[PDB]
């Protein structure tokens, strides 16, 4: 906000009614009123002042701090003691640079009255949640904040996967509408890479959601148990779609390979025809007589009765190999 | 019926004895008599008035309404509270357009005394159930309606799979009856696509049926537990048939690829023969004498004793490479 | 027997001591004495009078009758109520027509004092059991009849699988005894089809036997529990042999494909040699002098000092490409 | 021993202290003293007198006798009643004939005070155990005899697998030390066959050992429970090594196939070069002038200004296709 | 230390506060004070005096001694009695020789107050732990020593796997940045070998860590239960990365094979073009007239009206096969 900010991207105190207020860098001195309003803090994991405040503030165990300030992580849920669970989520990387896969990683520390979220590269889901909040229809408690974040991450991953599916649909309909048209490589490769890199991170998030759906009594009240369950369902459906997409890509690749091999065989057949017709014919014409037509007026060759038997032999060979080429 | 209908395809109050009656758009004022007769409503999921009535009528939780008015779904059973389970089923798409796979989706909300079914594209199973009903031999309670719908969906999926099997049988018997005959591509591809798209939706329905068969005490009385079990069995058998069909298609594809590769090798062999016979022979005839037979009457060549040794060398080379080509 | 029979193939009342007696079509009026003797009925599932009697006689639930008069089934065991289990078994189809796989289906309804068996195509196991019975050493109770049927079905499936194994052994020993000999296709294909079609039905029968072996206290007394267990073992062993046979067939196929590809490469090498030796040599001889030896007695060419440098260039090219072909 | 023996290979009464004594064919009249010494009998499963004595002696249930006198078996453990378990083990076939895989089968009937072992083809492990015994350091009870047999069978299977691994190591180091050197086929094939045939029988023995390790309280006192456990471990390690060996063989095969395909492409490239250089050049020289150098002293051709434009066209074609061949 | 050492690499008595002291070969006479300080001994498994002392000292069961002085082992945890567990770990082999895979094996015997570690080839993790210790910030109890060893082994295995990933990234970005550039073989092969040899040993260590994380109450106090759990997590992540790396390598290999096959087809097409254009044209020029231009001034050929029809036939053939080659 006004003045320079150390590491705090979005400092927003909730309201308990979907509303809220931004607090900015002067948040160590907030006195939250009766416990309906949570407090949300979005931190830049790269800025060293963020890690500084994160080490000594809001009383996090040094184990926890070291657990969400790592470099490489995989999606997982982690409960540490009567409160304070840790969730490691993966965005979908709609950054101006590239690569929808290679998913941005979002790390959440969920308390009963605080949520602290970490990221390196900006996420869309967080801006969605923010504009949701100041619109007066956002979440109202910590569990609701985590649910909104997960919901938006999934609402974008499924959009991406449906886009991949329509891309494959266009490729296929083009390939089969035309004929002897190869599918555009360097696109099937990118789609395969994308499906693999998506599954690699979506497989553990489904389990995160399943775990968040089963009991999680005190933290994330079962009011949202079925919501977490249907998020689990949506990721299951998306993984099914990913496997179907991979199998469709493999079918396209096998079809293309078979096509080029059959075309190879066809051109080899034509090559054999061209040779076997002309190589002998160019040899038998070797001992042929005068190569100009009708030397003595009526009939060009004279004395042919001796050696003319050769034109029959190469003709027999030709028709033999021709029947030998057909079958 | 008479007058214009908002979204209600089939409004049919059951009878408890297989009979029933159609009610039409004036159904908010039905007073069902003593509880033997259910009430069935088939809605068009696309018409906005259907979703309008569905939001505020028959007292469905907003969660439920939002759960069966989605766009993309996968087959699953869902129990929500002492009553009112939700089933998401997949037809087989016998629509005039195309594609037996890409299965029509049927979504059922089953109560103890009401069934509400949703669809976008028309389904055969529903017309089957209707003509069954007004024939006086249809279902008589809600569980029976859901069972009839599932039974008809399966009675058509197995017909489709047996059709696929006979198609593969015809293809194979043709291929092996003839010889060097390639199987009709663009048909093996469609059959493979069909098997994959069928399995993608049949794998969860088997689990739906298994779940509906295990306890489901209060809702779907165990009178039909064994019926749901045998529906589970039939889908298991059909999935086995689908895997067998996929493996048969893969065998046909490998056979065709091997055939074209071996034919490629054969035509390359013939090409090598044609060249290795004539390329040397066309070279040794280069320094040959007069290309017309018997110049000095008796014997055509003169002075051959010097350079005639060459015709032996290329002949040795020819028989060498010929023995080198055979083995 | 004497007189015309409606649908009853083998009507044989057991004895409790392995013996028995045939009853024929007049069996509705048998009064079985003190309960040591069962009653066996082998029915033709196709004859409509068999299904007629089967609907209303021996008091079978209409669900049961409809369950074993289906068209397509998979092997499974099915218990229905304090008695009366249903077993669906698969023979091995030693019929004069064809196809050891595509196994004949045998459907058994086992009671405490009755066995009713159904089939379309004749089975060997049943004739085995019959000739066993009238020999005085057959079964003596219902469980024993079902066990004998299963035992004979397995005694024939393992014979078939061992035959397949010896066939593969002969094929392999021929292929490796000789060299550059392709395995007989259209036989590897049939063996692969046979293994697949056998496994498709043997996988559920193993589970049938396991289930029949675990408790089945009242029906099939544990006197035969270990016998059912060893039948389970034998089918497990046969499935292991089937997987081993499939892997051996795949090894043979890969060996053949590698062989034809390497032969293809070899003939391409020979083709390149034939061309690269003669194509240049046939070109350099183009500007060669008189193609007859020793024109001016001593040395054929005159004035060669100008253009004779060319015979070195094509020779350098030849030895270059020859060294380029070797490595 | 002295006199002729019916079927008893090794008749050795143990001692309880690792020692013992051979008894020979006169063993029906041994009166074992206070129960520290077991009694071991190694029988030839082929000799009919062995099966004769085995049917009626040492009081084995006819079920048991029929269970270990079968023809085809798979490795399994089998407990039958308060005593008397049955183990079916597989040797490694170090017989002078051939085939380390195709493992000799050893069948053990273990009592609390008797061990009876059956075999067709001689086993090394048994001679090991014998020379161990008369050395004064052999087993002392029945469980110890079975453990020694299993221990020796494993000590030889792992030797064989390590030999396979070093063979693959030598093959690989040769292949990569040299270049364009194909791996010795007919050896990779034997190693693959060997790994498959070893796994086929080692997979169930691991389970035999695991079962023998879990409780087996009364029979095989838990004094050896951890020993059976580490035997389980050793077979697990050997199966891991077998899978690694199979994957290494597959890598070698793919490398060889890629190598021959790339060499095929290379020789095709050289063939295309040889033709495309000389086929046009041999055609343009067709209408060339006098093929001898310098006819009118200074410059050989006369009147070339009309048709000399052709030598440019085929040169353009040549450089075109040459650039078309490179890229 | 000073004087010659028999087999003891690192003899270091801990301190209970991260500190400690080296003891050297005179350690049989240490009297550890009140039980906060453990005692660590790193032994060379090859030196026979190490195995000598290890057989009779620190009171290890002969079973244990024989269990960790084996030759071939796989990673596993092993508890033997109220104390004294055995862990078999695998380093990453950063030895000057070669092969990051083929991992050095570290074998630990963990007591409540003693740790005894064995190795053949030197390990980095142990030097790390040592320099950690004498820096005053090392472990302080036995469980902490085992945890530090495992932590360092993992901190190096993940470094190696990330290096493999960046190597593949460089290879891919090169391949796709350029075009028709083959990936560097003999590097993809080494990376595949490395991934396989890493997984072969990392799969059991993950289970070691999971087991060490679940209860292990008395030995390895649950103070480190979550630490062992996150070590389990890190190995799970690394195995995921290994599978992703293998799939990326397979994609690169398939892309290269497709590229060489398509280039093969392209050069075959060019070869067919070169022949089919010139082979006929070189034949029709056979009977062509004078090969010098304009013999009678105005028009070179005379009498062509008879046989000139041939130049049309070979031209028709040429354009036919050309259209036959395109499609």
UniProtKB/Swiss-Prot annotation, chains A, B, C, D, E:
Keyword Hydrolase tagged: no
Periplasmic side: 283-303
Family matches, as Pfam families: CorA
Keywords: Cadmium, Cell inner membrane, Cell membrane, Cobalt, Cobalt transport, Ion transport, Membrane, Nickel, Nickel transport, Transmembrane, Transmembrane helix, Transport, Zinc, Zinc transport
Bilayer disposition of the protein: Multi-pass membrane protein
Transmembrane regions listed in the UniProt entry: 274-282, 304-319
GO molecular function: metal ion transmembrane transporter activity
Cytoplasmic side: 1-273, 320-327
GO biological process: cobalt ion transport; nickel cation transport; zinc ion transport
GO CC terms of this entry: plasma membrane
Domain of life: Bacteria
CDD domains: ZntB-like_1
SUPFAM superfamilies assigned to the protein according to its UniProt record, in alphabetical order: CorA soluble domain-like (SSF143865), Magnesium transport protein CorA, transmembrane region (SSF144083)
Protein location: Cell inner membrane
Reaction equation(s) it catalyzes: Zn(2+)(in) = Zn(2+)(out); Cd(2+)(in) = Cd(2+)(out); Ni(2+)(in) = Ni(2+)(out); Co(2+)(in) = Co(2+)(out)
Coarse class of the protein's main subcellular location: membrane
Family of this protein: Belongs to the CorA metal ion transporter (MIT) (TC 1.A.35) family.
Function: Transports divalent cations including Zn(2+), Cd(2+), Ni(2+) and Co(2+). The proton gradient has a small influence on transport suggesting that the transport is probably not proton-dependent.
PANTHER family: CORA FAMILY METAL ION TRANSPORTER (EUROFUNG) (PTHR46494), ZINC TRANSPORT PROTEIN ZNTB (PTHR46494:SF3)
Subunit structure of this chain's protein: Homopentamer.
UniProt name for this protein: Divalent cation transporter CmaX
């Amino acid at each position: 906000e006004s003045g320079d900010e150390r590491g705090l991207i979005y400092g927003y105190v909730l309201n308990g009614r979907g509303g809220g207020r931004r607090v900015g860098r002067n948040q160590i001195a907030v006195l939250d009123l009766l416990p309906e309003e949570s407090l949300w803090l979005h931190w830049d994991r790269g800025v060293p002042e963020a890690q500084a405040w994160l080490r000594d503030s809001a009383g996090l165990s040094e184990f926890a701090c070291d657990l969400l300030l790592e470099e490489a992580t995989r999606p997982r849920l982690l409960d540490l003691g009567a409160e304070s669970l840790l969730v490691f989520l993966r965005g979908v990387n709609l950054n101006p640079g590239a690569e929808p896969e290679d998913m941005v990683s979002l790390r959440v520390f969920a308390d009963a009255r605080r949520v602290i979220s970490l990221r390196l590269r900006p996420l869309k889901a967080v801006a969605d949640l923010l504009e949701d909040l100041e619109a007066g229809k956002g979440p109202k408690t910590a569990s609701e904040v985590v649910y909104y974040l997960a919901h938006y991450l999934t609402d974008r991953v499924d959009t991406l996967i449906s886009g991949i599916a329509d891309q494959l649909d266009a490729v296929e309909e083009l390939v089969e509408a035309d004929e002897r048209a190869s599918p555009d490589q360097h696109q099937l490769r990118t789609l395969r890479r994308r499906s693999a890199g998506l599954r690699r991170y979506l497989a553990p998030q489904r389990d995160i959601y399943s775990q968040l759906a089963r009991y999680k009594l005190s933290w994330f009240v079962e009011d949202d148990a079925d919501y977490w369950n249907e998020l689990n369902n949506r990721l299951t459906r998306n993984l099914e779609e990913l496997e179907l997409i991979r199998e469709r890509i493999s079918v396209l690749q096998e079809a293309e390979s078979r096509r080029i091999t059959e075309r190879m065989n066809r051109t080899m057949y034509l090559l054999g025809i061209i040779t076997g017709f002309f190589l002998p014919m160019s040899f038998v014409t070797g001992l042929l007589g005068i190569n100009v037509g009708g030397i003595p007026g009526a009939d060009a060759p004279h004395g042919f009765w001796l050696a003319c038997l050769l034109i029959g032999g190469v003709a027999t060979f030709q028709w033999w190999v021709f029947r030998r080429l057909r079958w």
